[PDB]
Amino acid sequence: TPVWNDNAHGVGSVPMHTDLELDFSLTSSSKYTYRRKLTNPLEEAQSIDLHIEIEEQTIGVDVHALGHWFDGRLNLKTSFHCYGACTKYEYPWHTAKCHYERDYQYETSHGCNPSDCPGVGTGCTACGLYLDQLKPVGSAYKIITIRYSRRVCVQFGEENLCKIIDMNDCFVSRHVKVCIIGTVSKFSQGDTLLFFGPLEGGGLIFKHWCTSTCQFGDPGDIMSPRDKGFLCPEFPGSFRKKCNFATTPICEYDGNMVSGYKKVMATIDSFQSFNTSTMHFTDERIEWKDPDGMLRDHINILVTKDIDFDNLGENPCKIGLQTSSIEGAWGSGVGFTLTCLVSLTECPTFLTSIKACDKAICYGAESVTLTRGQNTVKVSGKGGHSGSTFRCCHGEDCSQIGLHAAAPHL
Amino acid sequence: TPVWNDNAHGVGSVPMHTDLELDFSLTSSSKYTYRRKLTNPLEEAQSIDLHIEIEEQTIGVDVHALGHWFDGRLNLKTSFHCYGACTKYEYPWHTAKCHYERDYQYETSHGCNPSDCPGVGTGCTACGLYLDQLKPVGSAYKIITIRYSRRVCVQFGEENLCKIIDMNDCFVSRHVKVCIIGTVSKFSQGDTLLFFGPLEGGGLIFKHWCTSTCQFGDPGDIMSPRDKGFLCPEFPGSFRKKCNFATTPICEYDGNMVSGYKKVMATIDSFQSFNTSTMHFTDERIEWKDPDGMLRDHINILVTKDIDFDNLGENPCKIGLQTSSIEGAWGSGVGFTLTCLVSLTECPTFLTSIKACDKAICYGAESVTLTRGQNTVKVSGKGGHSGSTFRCCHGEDCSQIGLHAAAPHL
Amino acid sequence: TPVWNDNAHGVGSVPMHTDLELDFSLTSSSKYTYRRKLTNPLEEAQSIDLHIEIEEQTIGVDVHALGHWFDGRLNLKTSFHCYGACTKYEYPWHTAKCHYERDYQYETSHGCNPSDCPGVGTGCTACGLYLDQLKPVGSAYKIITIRYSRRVCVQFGEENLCKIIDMNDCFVSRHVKVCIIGTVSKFSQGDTLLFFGPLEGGGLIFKHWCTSTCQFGDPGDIMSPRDKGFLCPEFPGSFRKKCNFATTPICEYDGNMVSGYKKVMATIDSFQSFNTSTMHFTDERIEWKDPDGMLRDHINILVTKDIDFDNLGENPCKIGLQTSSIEGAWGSGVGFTLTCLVSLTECPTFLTSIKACDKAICYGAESVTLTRGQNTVKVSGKGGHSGSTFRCCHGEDCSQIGLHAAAPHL
């Protein structure tokens, strides 16, 4: 007959036995303070101090750091040899990391050879694109997860408790409930964030940063994912070997010659800027306060000063947790799966959530009806970094160790 | 003077004449049960049984089934003839559904003909790309509409009523109101969902699946919309006829040679996975429960145990409905328009909504102030399938027949 | 010790000293009216008239007008000269605004010259693409900002006040609070809206309208940003000079030949339509009422008929405002920054928001704790047009003049 459930964060109240409600829309980038002495209905001399502090909305974005985007120049060169294969010779652009070579091998001809070359069906002409004058222009991050929150601190008498409350969650105590309800549509999973400078100031949102196909001229075309090594873009155009009697062959390329950075700068007003305050970069995560004062969320504060609220998640069930295994990747939009061994006592069943967390950041959660004794629970998550040890958690309680996920993009 | 309106789903209450409020944030993937005996303020011996069951959030997505995505290999072949036009000969890739042919017709030359060919300005060389080693790798669906809901069941005494309540709608009864408020930003209209296997497990979200231009290497490049017949991608590159004295011409192609499936797999961590539970595929619709336990919505439950709520949509107006005509398409982001003949009696005017529905799924709605007597109301909708008969509906009441819309992509 | 703050829009109430609550989900495209005489608890003969009118949800979109999209035909022509450079001759497509020329200069050859041309390494063959049969097919607008609102009018006794209330903001008066809570996910910043006709009817949403790279065949490929002058698309394909003995060279082009409009029409069901009612176009802004009756928002109305609500933003602080400078652009996703000189009196500090507004439309806001005396406040904004004079505002109070921002896309 009993069916305990702690997935409800909130309270049951009797509207005539509630003493105070605050209900308001609050600028997302503003704090709010409420201070009041709660006094007995002219029917005593014992007041209770109420002090509520709500901090500015923070955004937390789990990301994959994509490294730096580069500007550069596309150069074209020609190399000719009357005799020999194309592997027999070293070309100038061979040291250039990003290059495109077209080999006109065993194709020497009368009206396309230089004067000293009586060759026919021999040798090699080389047309050769390369990127040079490379310069990093910004740091890019792929959005994996977006979560907004406010830190909420409530003092009621001598009770004092602070919690970080996620948007669309509630702070619950015996005498005070604080619920935050909101929506924001500025950032989307999959968006790529570009920071041009030491941009504790702002950046740009790109909705079409190249991923599976990068061609020269695309946003994100020339990337260096770490300190060294480029992920080079494609050059989809064609070469032409321009021929002439007694003259060295000359290469042409008929594709786009303008870098992605220049093309984007040329129409920069087409792209959306965002601003930031009190940034905090950590590995594969960015947190900040968005100072956009046009955005608001809804706050509701309910206070009962005598009889306790009915905490809707109250239960006698007790949970023990340890990790069993993990699969999948950090820094990945596909994510990972953490397998937990979860022991339930003091209840026949318990409907709750088991979370994958590390250092008080949670990356995934699974709702589950546990049965008395041992349970195996798989938790899907996204985010984290190579040093993350994902732990199995219930409420504020976590396993003693966590597990590392695998790296993405291997 | 009267202006009846049933577009408000909710209640008017007197806060001192309300007996119970439940207000909480609930894990989207969790159910919730509340059971209580409501007893008279120590001032009787007559209790009322309250039993509330809230089911897990379901997502319902109206889609267009795009058929299967394929992996494959791009092959290049050459075919030569000394004499004759290019239509006079059958080429090997002619049976290949996806191919690209370049005809070098009437262009035979001394240093590009085989030994047995003294031809000049004659015959034909054929360069010919074709896709082969094709394999379906998944089933794709274009999102047309996304709606979330929870089934809500309320027993109050002997009253017993269950309703599917859409997110941001309310359950309304004489003694109980249940409102659900939430937001989710995981899926977007226009997204394409890819299921790789029998994926009652999960899939991937693609935000840039090719539509008006599919080139080889794009996500969605090789599609078969039904059992047979491919929608073939473009091959944007160039051929080169490589010539040599007394040697057969040899074709080259300088465009991308890597399939979209391989390019996507090569950077799979760039794409967003989602998970599913208790899926239900029907024609052009997918329903499931998202087990992402990080998501929450807000539930409010208000109970008056003695005096009835004021139902804000209460009215004496009576509606009769029939379809008149339809235009437009199912399975289409542009949609359809259903024209309804709507008779109003017992009121001079009535502000309400008329809906286009079939089998208790609604695909569109129009708010309208009806006037006494006959009205013509056009309802815009999206979704459905070739077997859908869109009916004109008001509340839970529908016309006796519905109409079929036209197929998309004709 | 004092810390005044007016960023909270809402009220503090004592649930037993509140007389009426209306809580309901309302069709977004519907109005709502409430009329009632509030009478004293059978304990007087003095009623108060309550009359509430809530208007249909309006959307306001700040945009950049992109001008017209065109359909057209890609034509290819050849021009030959036996002798002379390619600048020495005028080509037919020189008057065509959108063209692609390939010059085969100083490349005359025996098996590629016409009969009257004994030239070798001389003259010029011209292959030349041009767009013609151009026709405007619609007007495009880039979304910069999306905001939804409802006009709310409340009469309480002789008090009468109307306000436009943004979604997720509250109407606040001494006796009545009206809060609107909602979410809509139909439009996104960066989306491009296409109107095909005099489309006070509807349009299409494009999520991938070309910006930094437009190739022929893309949505948005051929644009005229104003009355005259085209932004021409790229032609990424290659020309081929097809040669023959004693015959004039003939050009070919192996890239896409189908316009973006035709490609989009060919798969129009892949794109999302929206409908509109009572449109209002102004420079760089579009407002309308979305008649999609499937969408809803949440309305809460709380009334105290005797004792006033505690207005949570009540304060004695007084603000004076003037503009100091501006940088940045209207019609731009990057936006502008308005610098304001703000004088605070009657308080040591004041937490509030300063806004950049013109003609009662606000384009940006900054939350700030002002200190007594002079303050410099920077407000980031987006939207507006060349005639906008962005003013510094606090609540409904604005500076005497505003400043113009710079044009985008210079």
Ligand SMILES: *[C@@H]1O[C@H](CO[C@H]2O[C@@H](C)[C@@H](O)[C@@H](O)[C@@H]2O)[C@@H](O[C@@H]2O[C@H](CO)[C@@H](O)[C@H](O)[C@H]2NC(C)=O)[C@H](O)[C@H]1NC(C)=O
């Ligand atoms: C939730 O989904 C994950 C993700 O795996 C799926 O991802 C889809 C995008 C699609 O490619 C589908 O084919 C794929 O299965 C599931 O985890 C995966 O499970 C398979 C089968 O056991 C393993 O082979 C994978 O390694 C594993 N990947 C990860 C990252 O765990 C998962 O089972 C599913 N359900 C739950 C409860 O998490």
Ligand SMILES: *[C@@H]1O[C@H](CO[C@H]2O[C@@H](C)[C@@H](O)[C@@H](O)[C@@H]2O)[C@@H](O[C@@H]2O[C@H](CO)[C@@H](O)[C@H](O)[C@H]2NC(C)=O)[C@H](O)[C@H]1NC(C)=O
């Ligand atoms: C709501 O919009 C539909 C859709 O039709 C519009 O779609 C836009 C994307 C754009 O292309 C615009 O030019 C187009 O009119 C309207 O329905 C259409 O109405 C026209 C004119 O009568 C008919 O020729 C179409 O066949 C018809 N299409 C459909 C699917 O019904 C509709 O009138 C409009 N208003 C309402 C109330 O639904």
Ligand SMILES: *[C@@H]1O[C@H](CO[C@H]2O[C@@H](C)[C@@H](O)[C@@H](O)[C@@H]2O)[C@@H](O[C@@H]2O[C@H](CO)[C@@H](O)[C@H](O)[C@H]2NC(C)=O)[C@H](O)[C@H]1NC(C)=O
């Ligand atoms: C909010 O952001 C604006 C925007 O400027 C930033 O935009 C990013 C996309 C990125 O390119 C970054 O490098 C860039 O600084 C800030 O305004 C800019 O500030 C700089 C430095 O003083 C000026 O040179 C720019 O002209 C100016 N632009 C505009 C439009 O004002 C702004 O300082 C920042 N903070 C606030 C409070 O608005």
Ligand SMILES: [K+]
């Ligand atoms: K190429």
Ligand SMILES: [K+]
């Ligand atoms: K091609």
Ligand SMILES: [K+]
């Ligand atoms: K080209």
Ligand code: NA
């Ligand atoms: Na080419």
